[PDB]
Ligand binder design. Structure first.
Ligand SMILES: *[C@@H]1O[C@H](CO)[C@@H](O[C@@H]2O[C@H](CO)[C@@H](O)[C@H](O)[C@H]2NC(C)=O)[C@H](O)[C@H]1NC(C)=O
Ligand SMILES: *[C@@H]1O[C@H](CO)[C@@H](O)[C@H](O)[C@H]1NC(C)=O
Ligand SMILES: *[C@@H]1O[C@H](CO)[C@@H](O)[C@H](O)[C@H]1NC(C)=O
Lengths: 111, 49
């Protein structure tokens, strides 16, 4: 009914679309889905791991900050300090009130 | 017709009915209810403005 954002990694590039999606109740990707109707913007670009992200939505822009580092601890968050560089400054121009994460699954229940 | 104002540089594309009363509107513009978009009148026989 209103416009949504979607960022999807396919293990070789980055897809960013602002099309009008009618979603599932649990969306995921089978090791897949994105609807399409009446859009404006589209973008294509390029445990012992730790990636950190910061999202902001101010003045019609969508700010993203990023940093990756090799952790070697068991189950917590580390203790030191590392600052996050800027990544992208997408001009999407929507209203964002909730969000939800997309994982890679097997059982292809598309609701 | 719009409920609240806009923020800078954000656009609104939503062709759904907006109620001007406590009574519900469900696709029909009957009970003190309108359509949120109505068009223009661009005629060559008009003045400036
Ligand atoms: C952005 O979306 C939110 C959520 O849909 C809107 O917040 C609603 O605002 C109305 C009044 O305009 C309230 O009656 C609702 O309770 C609000 N919902 C929530 C979940 O907070 C918000 O108005 C939208 N932004 C703009 C500029 O309209
Ligand atoms: C995402 O990766 C798959 C790999 O099979 C590729 O076929 C597909 O073209 C990629 N998506 C886009 C939008 O290019
Ligand atoms: C998107 O635009 C097409 C043609 O411009 C229109 O048929 C369709 O209803 C629009 N979808 C919306 C506004 O959700």
């Amino acid at each position: 009914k209103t416009q949504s954002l979607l960022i999807v990694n396919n293990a070789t590039n980055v897809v960013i679309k602002v099309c009008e999606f009618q979603f599932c109740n649990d969306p995921f990707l089978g090791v897949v889905y994105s609807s399409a109707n009446n859009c404006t913007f589209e973008y294509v670009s390029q445990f012992k791991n730790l990636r950190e992200f910061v999202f902001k939505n101010i003045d019609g822009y969508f700010k993203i900050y990023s940093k990756h580092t090799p952790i070697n601890l068991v189950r917590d968050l580390p203790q030191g300090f590392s600052a996050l560089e800027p990544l992208v400054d997408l001009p999407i121009g929507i209203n964002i009130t909730r969000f939800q994460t997309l994982l890679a699954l097997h059982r292809s229940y598309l609701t | 017709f719009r409920k609240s104002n806009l923020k800078p540089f954000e656009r609104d594309i939503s062709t759904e009915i907006y109620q001007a009363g406590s009574t519900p509107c469900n696709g029909v513009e009957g009970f003190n209810c309108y359509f949120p978009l109505q068009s223009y009148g661009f005629q060559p026989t008009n003045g400036v403005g």
